[PDB]
DNA sequence: CCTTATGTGATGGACCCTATACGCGGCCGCCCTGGAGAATCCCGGTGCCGAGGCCGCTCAATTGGTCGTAGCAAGCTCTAGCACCGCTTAAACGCACGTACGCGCTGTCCCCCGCGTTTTAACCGCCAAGGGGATTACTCCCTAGTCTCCAGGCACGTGTCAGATATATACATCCTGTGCA
DNA sequence: TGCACAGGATGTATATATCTGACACGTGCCTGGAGACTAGGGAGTAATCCCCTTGGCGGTTAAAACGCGGGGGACAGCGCGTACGTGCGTTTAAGCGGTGCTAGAGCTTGCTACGACCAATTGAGCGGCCTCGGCACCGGGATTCTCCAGGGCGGCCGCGTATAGGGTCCATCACATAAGG
């Protein structure tokens, strides 16, 4: 796996921003958005993986993700809580 | 295009922004409170539109436009002036409208080189073979009017002619090579006729696609071991076409030869036109309704009035710029 | 046809007058010089009152024993994840045109800082308290932590009913030889 | 000759039916309520001692308020240049369902070893009290930064010396021609 930071593409950022109602966009936005997403994912994934490793475990379950997010204060409903 | 979308069921359609129908307008049957032509101005709008379009339409292929402004692009103006030769002033009729033109030649360099070679050959052939009379001045004048001066003697055949509007010197267009030219010796009038296709860009682009396909096929065959005419091709899109005809007046005998030599072999374009006439979709002829109802068409009437006002407001500045 | 010497008719050029740099001088941007002075720096140099040290002592950290059930170790088993196939688009991409948006610079003018004078809020000392509130303890007693039986109602699953999908049909939208006008 | 229609051909919106999801009804087990025992934390009771306003009052002070100048900050206009918006043709690999493996997850074990619970000791830690040196304030000489004035160069502007230069209007010039013999 390589260059997957690019894999998000521009059009995905476009559509997501479109949901946000932005009428006008700049080219530089994409790189910044990718960086923000990268650091967010890194933090969430580290929390989830440490939640997993506690349980003498190998498969990250949706419980690990949802409770990791809860520890980051971001509360998520609808996945078996 | 932004003109008010006509209310449903009006007895007219908006063609080119104006109320028109295919059939002859029956105001007396259709209108209860017809506004005067003065009130409507539809006729006025039509006339202004017609003239302007004739100044700017697609009849002749555009080739030069004055650049919209130590930029060296100024220095190119004399170069473009010199790349054409200057020729004398002539009148043109466009439908009910008439226009005036001065003539300009587009300098074919191959004709210059061939003329130098021909003078070389003639010189070598000749070497191998080997008060003041005003009436003479009049004879020279008449000779130069019906025979040819040097620039005309070189540019008899294959010379290139550019058209310009003396009321709008900003655009220059090519005289149609695919045109039928008739020189009336009795009236000194010249009638030009040509067929024009409204979706010609579509046909040219499909033509490019076909050319690419044929090139790809030839390349594929070569990997193992052309008068392309779009109008003949079976897969060509339907041309929306119009036939056009126009009369020139005021051209002098010597210029007629240059013009007469300039146009294409007649039978070939005739056959091409006949194909176009079988495959083409002819533009439908329709009638403008110059009178509108003050009540049902109030919005349309006022919109037209407003647009006319803006047009006139702009038109003064055009001479104020001179 | 030979054979003097120039008509034909513009693009190429010299000119008129324009307008200009700058001599001497000033407004001004600016280097910088320049002062006055409005702050800020660091070091006493001091007298105050808290940090922190010292002691009395008490109650809870530590100990040795017991009981018992929560975590651990397989380890049985089974289904959700992983991987490769391989058609089918369609979401990405390169590229073309333009246009309306962001930035650079404009002049304007109004409001909010720097500063001076007046007005208000607050404390000291008058005059020394009483009220009532939070902390502290004793004394029942009631409450639901506990084990246990009873019998269930709630959860896991299968059957049934509906919907979305599938495909005959009763003509629908037409082909085409040929007998009729 | 060309039209009317007798005889015949693909199709399809209409109509009849088959191919997938979700909800209600049946089993059946880890239960939830209930009965009775239980005690020690909650709640009712009683100081008790300490901290909170009295209450407005004058004589003051430090901070708040109000007034003013002005100058520069905000900000509405807008020339323009381009970099995102819209629209192609074209490619990728994201999506779809399919086949073959598995290893990681789920849980049932059988029971142990470590920690809940308990008397008893004792010393670390808290509560009270006492103190000199770490802190708090600023006086001073010195640092340093602010801001208008402005010496002086000279960008640019002013009176006007004399001067260098352009667009503007004038023409001179060449190819091959007009004429005589």
XYZ file of C-alpha atoms (C1' of nucleotides) in Angstrom:
765
model
C 0.000 0.000 0.000
C 1.381 3.370 -1.106
C 0.256 6.914 -1.939
C -3.201 6.158 -0.521
C -3.307 9.688 0.909
C -3.914 10.588 -2.740
C -6.497 7.804 -3.018
C -9.114 10.056 -1.407
C -9.022 11.960 -4.752
C -10.182 15.527 -5.273
C -13.817 14.666 -6.237
C -14.488 13.022 -2.856
C -13.339 16.168 -1.046
C -15.499 18.068 -3.532
C -18.637 16.067 -2.711
C -18.029 16.249 1.047
C -17.559 20.017 0.871
C -20.707 20.145 -1.279
C -22.571 18.586 1.634
C -21.093 21.440 3.680
C -22.747 23.912 1.302
C -19.536 25.583 0.103
C -20.227 27.437 -3.151
C -16.565 28.158 -3.994
C -13.424 26.084 -3.370
C -9.651 26.498 -3.733
C -7.127 23.973 -5.007
C -5.010 24.128 -1.850
C -7.972 22.932 0.260
C -7.477 19.305 -0.800
C -3.997 18.900 0.704
C -5.018 20.546 3.989
C -8.140 18.376 4.132
C -6.004 15.280 3.586
C -3.628 16.282 6.378
C -6.491 16.904 8.801
C -8.051 13.561 7.886
C -4.675 11.860 8.320
C -4.130 13.133 11.857
C -7.753 12.422 12.823
C -7.505 8.862 11.518
C -4.145 8.329 13.215
C -5.542 9.337 16.605
C -8.774 7.348 16.276
C -6.943 4.265 14.993
C -4.325 4.373 17.749
C -7.065 4.586 20.377
C -9.043 1.753 18.779
C -5.988 -0.502 18.415
C -4.986 0.009 22.043
C -8.586 -0.756 23.041
C -8.244 -3.976 21.034
C -4.831 -5.024 22.344
C -6.098 -4.927 25.938
C -8.429 -7.857 25.272
C -5.696 -10.265 24.079
C -7.146 -9.699 20.660
C -6.345 -9.553 16.958
C -9.508 -8.244 15.226
C -10.506 -4.616 15.759
C -14.250 -4.725 16.401
C -16.830 -1.971 16.009
C -16.962 -1.811 19.808
C -13.292 -0.798 19.877
C -13.924 1.943 17.307
C -17.043 3.307 18.983
C -15.569 3.361 22.486
C -12.322 4.883 21.206
C -14.408 7.642 19.630
C -16.281 8.041 22.921
C -12.925 8.563 24.638
C -12.220 11.315 22.095
C -15.606 12.763 23.105
C -17.095 12.077 19.657
C -20.232 10.046 20.374
C -21.556 7.708 17.679
C -24.901 5.884 17.726
C -26.351 3.056 15.658
C -23.623 0.400 15.679
C -24.835 -1.966 18.381
C -24.248 0.240 21.421
C -31.795 33.819 -24.045
C -32.651 35.494 -20.743
C -35.767 36.985 -22.360
C -38.992 36.363 -20.439
C -40.305 32.828 -20.941
C -43.565 33.433 -22.810
C -46.779 32.519 -21.030
C -48.285 29.236 -22.188
C -50.524 29.177 -25.295
C -49.580 32.549 -26.800
C -50.477 32.637 -30.534
C -46.812 33.332 -31.276
C -43.466 31.731 -30.549
C -40.290 33.526 -29.486
C -37.815 32.955 -32.328
C -34.443 34.710 -31.982
C -35.986 36.505 -29.017
C -38.931 37.888 -30.993
C -42.571 36.780 -31.430
C -42.955 34.822 -34.663
C -45.032 32.041 -36.201
C -44.610 29.848 -39.267
C -47.966 31.001 -40.663
C -48.770 34.562 -41.701
C -49.926 36.588 -38.656
C -53.698 37.010 -38.445
C -53.868 39.974 -36.066
C -57.524 40.739 -36.848
C -58.627 37.249 -35.810
C -56.234 36.890 -32.880
C -55.860 40.305 -31.213
C -58.595 42.158 -29.326
C -56.420 45.098 -28.208
C -53.460 45.179 -30.611
C -50.798 47.672 -29.672
C -49.619 49.771 -32.598
C -46.361 48.881 -34.308
C -45.231 52.141 -32.716
C -46.280 50.682 -29.364
C -44.789 47.250 -30.079
C -41.612 48.204 -31.934
C -41.250 44.529 -32.914
C -40.515 45.667 -36.472
C -37.836 48.053 -35.177
C -36.277 45.328 -33.021
C -36.291 42.979 -36.006
C -34.617 45.537 -38.269
C -31.880 46.451 -35.777
C -31.278 42.749 -35.067
C -31.100 41.998 -38.804
C -28.572 44.741 -39.550
C -26.393 43.926 -36.536
C -26.426 40.201 -37.350
C -25.444 40.969 -40.950
C -22.543 42.937 -39.472
C -21.626 40.033 -37.165
C -23.150 36.843 -38.588
C -21.571 33.592 -39.735
C -22.030 34.172 -43.487
C -18.277 34.513 -44.139
C -15.502 32.815 -42.160
C -13.839 35.287 -39.783
C -10.060 35.582 -40.059
C -8.962 38.774 -38.283
C -10.362 40.720 -35.333
C -8.921 43.886 -33.792
C -7.337 42.809 -30.473
C -9.364 43.930 -27.461
C -6.962 46.102 -25.468
C 5.239 48.510 -24.193
C 3.058 45.625 -25.405
C 4.482 44.712 -28.844
C 0.951 43.779 -29.992
C 0.680 47.384 -31.212
C 3.549 46.754 -33.639
C 1.557 43.922 -35.224
C -1.080 46.332 -36.590
C 1.204 47.618 -39.407
C 2.279 44.023 -40.090
C -1.350 42.965 -40.548
C -1.895 46.087 -42.668
C 1.021 45.150 -44.933
C 0.107 41.463 -45.165
C -2.968 42.635 -47.111
C -3.047 44.880 -50.174
C -5.466 47.792 -50.507
C -8.330 47.789 -53.022
C -11.270 49.953 -53.931
C -14.662 50.540 -52.438
C -17.704 48.510 -53.371
C -21.314 48.059 -52.275
C -23.133 44.995 -50.945
C -26.803 44.184 -50.363
C -27.941 41.921 -47.531
C -31.601 41.014 -47.859
C -33.480 44.306 -47.559
C -30.286 45.814 -46.102
C -27.260 47.254 -47.902
C -23.631 47.691 -46.845
C -20.396 49.132 -48.222
C -16.950 47.538 -48.355
C -13.382 48.247 -49.367
C -11.467 45.332 -50.844
C -8.266 43.740 -49.510
C -6.034 41.002 -50.965
C -4.479 38.249 -48.840
C -0.932 37.819 -50.151
C -0.306 34.245 -51.344
C 3.484 33.890 -51.073
C 3.569 30.876 -53.405
C 2.211 33.130 -56.149
C 5.066 35.559 -55.444
C 7.738 32.866 -55.674
C 6.182 31.386 -58.818
C 5.987 34.865 -60.365
C 9.696 35.381 -59.702
C 10.464 31.988 -61.248
C 8.265 32.803 -64.255
C 10.025 36.134 -64.791
C 13.335 34.259 -64.581
C 12.164 31.757 -67.201
C 10.830 34.479 -69.510
C 14.062 36.484 -69.254
C 16.139 33.388 -70.020
C 13.846 32.531 -72.947
C 14.195 36.031 -74.403
C 17.978 35.890 -73.979
C 18.070 32.483 -75.690
C 15.906 33.625 -78.612
C 18.053 36.724 -79.206
C 2.167 69.726 -73.943
C 2.505 66.016 -73.174
C 0.003 63.760 -74.945
C -2.886 63.597 -72.475
C -4.557 60.987 -74.696
C -1.741 58.591 -73.797
C -2.422 59.231 -70.104
C -6.107 58.453 -70.681
C -5.138 55.278 -72.550
C -2.888 54.230 -69.655
C -5.729 54.940 -67.214
C -8.192 52.809 -69.180
C -5.614 50.039 -69.640
C -4.891 49.946 -65.906
C -8.652 49.883 -65.293
C -9.390 46.897 -67.570
C -5.942 45.306 -67.910
C -3.651 44.688 -64.927
C -0.957 46.583 -63.053
C 1.983 44.624 -61.650
C 0.312 43.675 -58.361
C -2.746 42.634 -60.349
C -0.609 40.903 -62.984
C 0.898 38.666 -60.294
C -2.378 38.193 -58.367
C -4.647 37.250 -61.284
C -5.281 33.640 -60.233
C -5.217 32.061 -56.797
C -5.241 35.457 -55.115
C -6.957 35.574 -51.729
C -9.701 38.125 -51.023
C -10.652 39.495 -47.590
C -13.928 41.273 -46.785
C -14.296 44.149 -44.315
C -17.264 46.310 -43.294
C -16.692 50.043 -43.712
C -19.164 50.657 -40.868
C -17.413 48.092 -38.640
C -13.707 47.754 -39.494
C -13.109 45.446 -36.515
C -13.753 42.110 -38.269
C -12.439 40.547 -41.485
C -13.963 37.502 -43.175
C -13.068 35.095 -45.983
C -14.920 35.244 -49.280
C -16.609 31.815 -49.656
C -14.597 29.554 -51.946
C -17.531 27.102 -51.979
C -19.704 29.697 -53.692
C -21.309 30.250 -57.093
C -20.328 33.611 -58.597
C -22.155 35.284 -61.497
C -20.741 38.500 -62.990
C -23.466 40.566 -64.687
C -21.713 42.593 -67.388
C -24.825 44.670 -68.127
C -25.536 45.839 -64.564
C -22.024 45.457 -63.057
C -23.674 43.367 -60.322
C -22.280 40.116 -58.914
C -24.528 37.515 -57.270
C -22.967 34.984 -54.880
C -24.802 31.861 -53.686
C -23.778 29.298 -51.068
C -25.278 26.683 -48.742
C -24.662 27.055 -44.997
C -25.057 24.438 -42.248
C -26.061 25.560 -38.754
C -24.534 22.518 -36.992
C -21.345 22.608 -39.087
C -19.236 22.404 -35.910
C -20.946 19.099 -35.066
C -20.124 17.748 -38.530
C -16.501 18.931 -38.345
C -16.004 17.350 -34.911
C -17.559 14.046 -35.995
C -15.318 14.299 -39.075
C -12.286 14.620 -36.799
C -13.449 11.568 -34.841
C -13.778 9.562 -38.066
C -10.338 10.728 -39.224
C -8.910 9.549 -35.905
C -10.665 6.194 -36.296
C -9.266 5.687 -39.801
C -5.782 6.708 -38.650
C -6.007 4.224 -35.770
C -7.105 1.454 -38.137
C -4.235 2.194 -40.527
C -1.797 2.201 -37.601
C -3.151 -1.146 -36.390
C -2.703 -2.628 -39.865
C 0.817 -1.189 -40.129
C 1.662 -2.771 -36.767
C 1.205 -6.137 -38.499
C 2.904 -5.467 -41.845
C -7.277 11.162 -48.778
C -10.183 13.423 -49.779
C -12.214 12.601 -46.682
C -15.577 14.262 -47.325
C -17.865 14.464 -44.257
C -20.908 15.308 -46.376
C -20.643 12.041 -48.333
C -20.242 9.899 -45.211
C -23.227 7.733 -44.293
C -22.872 8.410 -40.548
C -22.757 12.208 -40.843
C -25.245 13.955 -38.512
C -28.226 15.675 -40.135
C -27.116 19.115 -41.364
C -29.520 21.829 -40.405
C -28.812 23.827 -43.544
C -29.803 27.027 -45.278
C -29.169 28.086 -48.867
C -28.023 31.688 -49.133
C -27.687 34.164 -51.990
C -26.322 37.721 -52.082
C -25.648 40.362 -54.737
C -22.553 42.554 -54.979
C -22.506 45.793 -56.952
C -19.757 48.253 -57.802
C -16.813 45.987 -58.706
C -14.672 46.913 -61.715
C -13.754 44.765 -64.709
C -10.155 44.054 -63.683
C -11.228 42.795 -60.247
C -13.795 40.397 -61.750
C -11.049 38.245 -63.292
C -9.284 37.972 -59.927
C -12.585 37.087 -58.258
C -13.623 34.753 -61.083
C -10.273 32.938 -60.905
C -10.378 32.780 -57.094
C -13.391 30.468 -56.690
C -13.331 26.673 -56.783
C -14.050 24.320 -59.712
C -17.799 24.554 -60.164
C -18.904 20.965 -60.864
C -17.255 19.613 -57.704
C -18.996 22.086 -55.403
C -22.236 21.569 -57.356
C -22.126 17.831 -56.653
C -21.232 18.520 -53.021
C -24.209 20.884 -52.767
C -26.514 18.281 -54.323
C -25.428 15.779 -51.682
C -25.955 18.451 -49.006
C -29.420 19.097 -50.445
C -30.401 15.457 -50.192
C -28.978 14.992 -46.681
C -29.689 18.503 -45.347
C -32.534 19.709 -43.144
C -33.756 23.021 -44.583
C -34.487 25.928 -42.233
C -38.241 26.515 -41.928
C -39.662 29.848 -43.097
C -41.798 31.727 -40.579
C -43.600 35.054 -40.112
C -43.029 37.664 -37.388
C -46.071 38.991 -35.490
C -45.177 42.678 -35.199
C -48.349 43.493 -33.205
C -48.831 42.315 -29.614
C -51.684 42.537 -27.116
C -51.111 45.244 -24.503
C -52.731 43.102 -21.791
C -51.741 39.467 -22.365
C -48.268 40.444 -23.638
C -47.549 43.396 -21.325
C -44.419 41.737 -19.912
C -43.096 40.883 -23.372
C -43.820 44.375 -24.697
C -42.073 46.133 -21.805
C -39.141 43.701 -21.997
C -38.663 44.481 -25.690
C -38.949 48.212 -24.966
C -36.311 47.982 -22.222
C -33.898 46.027 -24.421
C -34.394 48.540 -27.246
C -33.632 51.360 -24.807
C -30.394 49.680 -23.740
C -29.421 49.016 -27.365
C -29.945 52.673 -28.285
C -28.115 53.827 -25.148
C -25.093 51.767 -26.192
C -25.348 52.817 -29.851
C -24.601 56.504 -29.174
C -21.304 55.616 -27.514
C -20.230 53.800 -30.679
C -19.926 57.061 -32.604
C -18.784 58.843 -29.445
C -15.769 56.502 -29.549
C -14.827 57.779 -33.024
C 12.458 44.793 -82.394
C 16.489 48.322 -80.450
C 17.210 51.901 -77.428
C 16.748 56.749 -74.779
C 15.389 58.556 -70.421
C 11.246 58.903 -67.519
C 5.269 58.173 -65.555
C 3.556 56.247 -62.044
C 2.176 56.667 -57.475
C 3.874 54.718 -52.075
C 6.467 54.081 -48.300
C 10.058 56.116 -46.428
C 11.864 60.049 -44.416
C 13.108 65.019 -42.343
C 10.870 68.289 -40.145
C 8.047 71.490 -36.709
C 6.886 72.160 -32.512
C 6.365 70.064 -28.447
C 7.422 69.090 -24.064
C 10.851 68.590 -21.436
C 15.289 68.145 -17.850
C 16.765 70.587 -14.641
C 19.488 75.661 -12.476
C 18.063 77.085 -8.164
C 14.810 76.157 -4.758
C 11.018 73.813 -1.817
C 7.625 69.663 -0.063
C 8.609 65.504 0.879
C 10.417 60.217 1.656
C 13.964 58.955 3.871
C 18.883 58.094 6.465
C 20.249 59.652 10.406
C 21.105 62.747 13.696
C 19.271 64.698 17.579
C 17.321 65.854 21.906
C 14.038 65.390 25.599
C 12.000 62.451 28.147
C 8.867 58.378 29.020
C 8.939 54.417 30.034
C 11.889 49.847 31.629
C 16.120 47.217 33.631
C 18.608 45.352 37.785
C 20.364 45.905 42.846
C 20.164 46.891 46.500
C 18.151 47.874 51.005
C 14.943 47.410 53.965
C 11.081 45.502 57.358
C 7.361 42.214 57.380
C 4.781 37.071 58.250
C 4.544 33.024 56.143
C 6.925 28.238 54.939
C 8.311 24.804 56.810
C 10.129 22.684 60.733
C 9.428 20.738 65.001
C 6.614 17.949 68.448
C 1.998 15.038 70.466
C -0.320 11.757 69.437
C -3.965 8.528 67.121
C -6.053 5.802 63.936
C -5.309 3.375 59.931
C -1.386 0.927 57.190
C 0.530 -3.340 58.029
C 0.559 -8.131 59.499
C -0.532 -13.489 59.648
C -4.410 -16.532 58.805
C -8.641 -18.277 56.336
C -11.787 -19.049 53.165
C -13.643 -19.201 48.379
C -14.622 -18.077 43.780
C -12.685 -14.957 39.468
C -9.038 -15.551 36.010
C -6.542 -18.315 33.735
C -5.449 -22.265 30.543
C -6.445 -25.067 27.199
C -9.102 -26.352 23.671
C -13.351 -27.442 21.131
C -15.585 -25.420 17.151
C -17.400 -22.603 13.789
C -18.302 -18.330 10.844
C -16.678 -13.788 9.540
C -12.560 -12.128 7.169
C -9.334 -12.743 3.425
C -7.869 -13.570 -1.120
C -8.302 -14.040 -6.376
C -11.809 -14.038 -10.644
C -13.548 -11.234 -13.890
C -17.429 -8.379 -16.168
C -19.590 -3.308 -15.771
C -19.884 0.537 -15.602
C -18.887 5.736 -13.797
C -16.314 8.233 -11.057
C -11.608 10.297 -11.986
C -8.960 12.325 -14.838
C -6.699 15.534 -18.677
C -7.879 19.338 -21.158
C -10.235 23.055 -23.244
C -12.637 27.771 -22.615
C -14.063 32.291 -19.500
C -15.622 34.824 -16.163
C -16.490 36.393 -12.021
C -14.106 36.432 -8.163
C -9.886 38.010 -5.034
C -6.333 41.253 -4.581
C -3.974 46.105 -5.067
C -4.621 50.294 -4.779
C -7.859 54.443 -4.250
C -10.072 58.353 -1.409
C -13.190 59.175 2.598
C -14.731 60.058 6.811
C -16.004 58.690 11.685
C -14.998 56.671 15.713
C -12.145 55.241 19.243
C -7.241 56.105 21.376
C -4.285 59.607 24.296
C -5.105 62.691 27.555
C -7.400 66.352 31.314
C -10.924 67.422 34.367
C -15.124 65.792 37.611
C -17.647 62.524 39.806
C -18.513 58.075 42.250
C -17.322 53.632 45.175
C -14.945 51.996 48.360
C -12.437 51.589 53.087
C -11.076 53.333 58.078
C -12.858 54.096 62.255
C -17.113 55.105 64.717
C -19.625 51.578 67.732
C -19.313 45.543 69.724
C -22.349 43.002 69.090
C -26.622 38.829 68.339
C -28.184 35.476 64.948
C -28.066 31.586 62.986
C -25.538 28.708 60.482
C -22.186 24.274 59.610
C -19.974 20.931 62.105
C -20.133 17.249 65.353
C -21.941 13.285 67.944
C -25.310 9.708 69.868
C -29.235 6.562 68.983
C -32.318 3.679 67.118
C -34.421 1.185 63.035
C -35.393 0.483 58.845
C -33.665 -0.589 54.746
C -32.425 -3.595 50.850
C -27.670 -6.984 50.724
C -28.240 -11.936 51.208
C -29.812 -17.013 50.055
C -33.400 -19.310 48.325
C -37.763 -21.114 45.622
C -41.278 -20.342 42.253
C -42.628 -19.930 37.787
C -42.214 -16.970 34.153
C -41.818 -13.476 30.123
C -38.625 -12.510 27.540
C -35.386 -13.836 23.742
C -34.077 -17.121 19.597
C -35.962 -19.073 16.197
C -39.351 -20.681 12.340
C -43.801 -19.687 9.370
C -46.575 -16.858 7.353
C -47.779 -12.895 4.718
C -46.243 -8.972 1.166
C -43.555 -6.719 -2.003
C -40.607 -6.146 -5.575
C -39.473 -8.539 -9.537
C -40.466 -11.443 -13.455
C -42.808 -12.754 -18.000
C -47.171 -14.191 -20.959
C -50.901 -11.691 -23.999
C -54.353 -9.770 -26.486
C -53.812 -7.371 -29.236
C -49.923 -3.183 -30.923
C -47.297 -1.564 -34.087
C -46.603 -3.165 -38.722
C -44.851 -6.281 -43.213
C -45.932 -7.631 -47.782
C -47.945 -10.267 -52.005
C -51.933 -9.176 -55.282
C -56.557 -8.355 -56.650
C -59.038 -4.008 -57.752
C -59.866 0.876 -59.916
C -49.972 2.038 -63.523
C -50.897 2.617 -59.184
C -54.040 1.868 -55.350
C -56.775 -1.181 -51.830
C -56.552 -5.021 -48.839
C -55.959 -10.043 -48.236
C -52.902 -12.545 -45.951
C -49.249 -12.497 -42.886
C -44.688 -10.518 -38.917
C -42.471 -9.120 -35.671
C -43.250 -6.884 -30.952
C -45.260 -4.748 -26.138
C -48.081 -2.130 -22.843
C -51.097 -4.592 -20.698
C -51.794 -8.142 -17.614
C -50.764 -12.529 -14.875
C -47.504 -14.557 -12.091
C -42.712 -15.877 -9.646
C -38.774 -14.610 -6.962
C -37.025 -12.092 -2.132
C -37.817 -9.358 3.162
C -39.905 -8.407 7.011
C -43.119 -9.199 11.043
C -45.925 -12.429 14.374
C -46.386 -16.571 16.576
C -44.064 -20.888 19.141
C -40.610 -22.938 22.302
C -38.100 -22.892 26.435
C -34.193 -20.900 30.188
C -31.789 -18.038 32.684
C -33.965 -15.768 34.740
C -37.471 -11.320 38.174
C -40.499 -11.256 42.188
C -41.188 -12.789 46.262
C -40.202 -14.679 51.742
C -37.629 -14.311 55.281
C -33.004 -13.093 57.829
C -30.128 -9.691 58.488
C -27.177 -4.919 60.457
C -25.136 -1.016 60.177
C -25.776 3.587 57.266
C -29.437 6.736 57.207
C -32.064 9.654 59.583
C -33.778 11.973 63.928
C -31.858 14.360 67.559
C -28.506 18.472 70.244
C -25.440 20.878 71.072
C -21.567 24.419 70.086
C -18.717 27.483 68.580
C -17.605 30.635 64.872
C -18.452 33.466 61.239
C -21.500 36.622 59.120
C -24.103 41.602 58.882
C -25.254 45.723 62.291
C -26.267 50.226 59.504
C -25.498 55.035 58.119
C -21.982 57.946 58.738
C -17.623 61.793 57.305
C -13.345 62.088 55.696
C -10.887 60.848 52.661
C -8.667 58.079 48.243
C -8.344 55.222 43.530
C -11.012 54.108 39.773
C -14.887 55.469 36.780
C -16.846 58.521 34.020
C -17.279 62.127 30.866
C -15.281 65.625 27.163
C -12.463 66.668 23.663
C -8.789 66.262 19.072
C -7.648 64.053 15.515
C -5.699 60.902 12.664
C -5.503 56.827 10.895
C -8.735 52.126 10.268
C -12.332 50.665 8.311
C -14.444 50.256 4.139
C -17.024 50.984 -0.191
C -15.248 51.298 -5.510
C -13.159 49.246 -8.801
C -9.030 47.674 -12.711
C -7.687 43.516 -13.891
C -5.811 38.858 -14.103
C -6.207 34.672 -13.280
C -7.476 29.982 -11.234
C -11.832 27.385 -10.297
C -16.477 26.416 -12.640
C -18.778 23.811 -16.601
C -18.309 20.686 -20.234
C -16.512 17.356 -23.096
C -13.555 12.524 -24.452
C -11.364 9.104 -22.296
C -9.475 5.307 -18.298
C -9.485 3.094 -13.896
C -10.566 0.500 -10.613
C -14.683 0.651 -7.454
C -18.765 -2.371 -7.259
C -21.228 -6.609 -8.165
C -21.658 -11.522 -7.199
C -18.883 -15.884 -7.232
C -15.156 -20.078 -4.957
C -12.168 -21.612 -2.060
C -9.759 -21.473 2.876
C -9.105 -20.230 7.641
C -7.919 -18.346 12.158
C -9.462 -15.680 14.969
C -13.441 -15.282 17.926
C -16.937 -17.377 21.274
C -17.526 -20.258 25.226
C -17.447 -24.311 27.695
C -14.693 -26.636 30.685
C -12.141 -27.388 35.724
C -10.446 -25.317 39.427
C -6.459 -22.169 42.140
C -4.195 -18.681 43.859
C -4.783 -14.308 45.245
C -7.555 -11.158 47.292
C -12.096 -10.054 50.456
C -12.466 -10.250 55.292
C -10.810 -10.327 60.067
C -7.962 -9.078 65.163
C -4.085 -6.754 66.633
C 0.413 -3.366 66.582
C 2.598 0.783 65.913
C 4.578 4.868 63.231
C 3.807 7.471 59.597
C 0.975 11.413 58.900
C -1.969 15.047 60.552
C -2.980 19.015 63.771
C -1.051 22.735 66.470
C 2.288 26.109 67.037
C 6.251 28.723 66.486
C 9.883 31.673 63.446
C 13.845 34.421 60.735
C 14.905 35.001 55.829
C 12.275 34.906 51.209
C 9.594 38.044 49.770
C 7.482 42.781 48.421
C 8.330 47.992 47.077
C 10.678 51.133 44.986
C 15.130 54.840 44.573
C 18.470 55.107 41.864
C 21.723 55.322 37.800
C 21.514 53.560 33.645
C 19.137 51.579 29.513
C 16.396 52.184 25.562
C 12.840 53.431 22.858
C 9.695 56.887 21.061
C 8.574 61.033 17.884
C 8.665 65.463 16.115
C 12.229 68.684 14.085
C 14.973 68.722 10.348
C 20.658 68.749 7.937
C 20.855 67.094 3.854
C 20.255 63.921 -1.019
C 17.510 64.209 -4.224
C 12.204 62.091 -6.269
C 9.235 65.082 -7.733
C 7.133 69.744 -8.361
C 7.630 75.109 -9.346
C 9.454 79.473 -12.376
C 11.290 79.396 -16.408
C 16.340 78.573 -18.934
C 17.601 76.147 -23.218
C 17.302 72.147 -24.482
C 16.472 66.796 -26.622
C 13.266 64.502 -28.869
C 8.665 62.380 -31.371
C 4.187 62.104 -34.731
C 3.360 64.343 -38.090
C 3.152 65.894 -42.645
C 5.982 66.094 -46.886
C 8.450 63.943 -50.630
C 11.694 61.459 -53.366
C 12.444 57.585 -55.357
C 12.449 52.954 -58.335
C 10.382 49.514 -62.134
C 9.886 48.962 -66.451
C 7.776 51.890 -69.463
C 6.465 55.870 -73.788
C 8.342 57.212 -77.806
C 11.246 57.546 -82.347
C 13.093 54.712 -86.146
